[PDB]
Design a protein around this ligand. Structure first.
Ligand SMILES: [Zn+2]
Ligand SMILES: [Zn+2]
Ligand SMILES: [Zn+2]
Ligand SMILES: [Zn+2]
Ligand SMILES: [Zn+2]
Length: 190
């Protein structure tokens, strides 16, 4: 169904849909591992399906249509606690590379592309534990795509080599994120 912000289980998959209160976004859970998002003049939002809790060796399959018009990402996305970390394995993005201005720490080759690795920080921003300061870990795929498989272990292991430690995994989803833009997407996870 189309839903308001929240989390839960739908047709065998965890989902998380969050937004900053700005209008312009419609997030809809579909059959099985499918979800869709349609947005126009949105604020910041993040929505998708996966698992709760996530694991450090899952191979995640995603497919569908991803048509952003502006700033948006399509990523394997999740959190850990102890330490609190928001992480992204970005498979595709729109007009803005999320690593812009960030210091590159490394690279990893996985599932048909090299990815560049970065660490950034958010100060007193929304998080799974409420407003908080936390680091973000990024692997950014060089060869953009909208279907395929992500061997998360390759990324988590590469990050660990850079001192980017993950604690206990909270949720782990394939998420469509938008930042004051427009677009449409229909993604299926497994
Ligand atoms: Zn393009
Ligand atoms: Zn592209
Ligand atoms: Zn392309
Ligand atoms: Zn391109
Ligand atoms: Zn292109």
């Amino acid at each position: 169904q189309t839903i308001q912000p929240g989390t839960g289980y739908n047709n065998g998959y965890f989902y998380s849909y969050w937004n900053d209160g700005h209008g312009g976004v419609t997030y809809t859970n579909g059959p099985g591992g499918q979800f869709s998002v349609n947005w126009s003049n949105s604020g910041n939002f993040v929505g998708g399906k996966g698992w709760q809790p996530g694991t450090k060796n899952k191979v995640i399959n995603f497919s569908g249509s991803y048509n952003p018009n502006g700033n948006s990402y399509l990523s394997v996305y999740g959190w850990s606690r102890n330490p609190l970390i928001e992480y992204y394995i970005v498979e595709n993005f729109g007009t803005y590379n999320p690593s812009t201005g960030a210091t590159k720490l490394g690279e990893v080759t996985s599932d048909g592309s090299v990815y560049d690795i970065y660490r950034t920080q958010r100060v007193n921003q929304p998080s799974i534990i409420g407003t908080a300061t936390f680091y973000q870990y990024w692997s950014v795929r060089r060869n953009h795509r909208s279907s395929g498989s992500v061997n998360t272990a390759n990324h988590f292991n590469a990050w660990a080599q850079q001192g980017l430690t993950l604690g206990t995994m909270d949720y782990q989803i394939v998420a469509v994120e938008g930042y004051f833009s427009s677009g449409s997407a229909s993604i299926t996870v497994s």
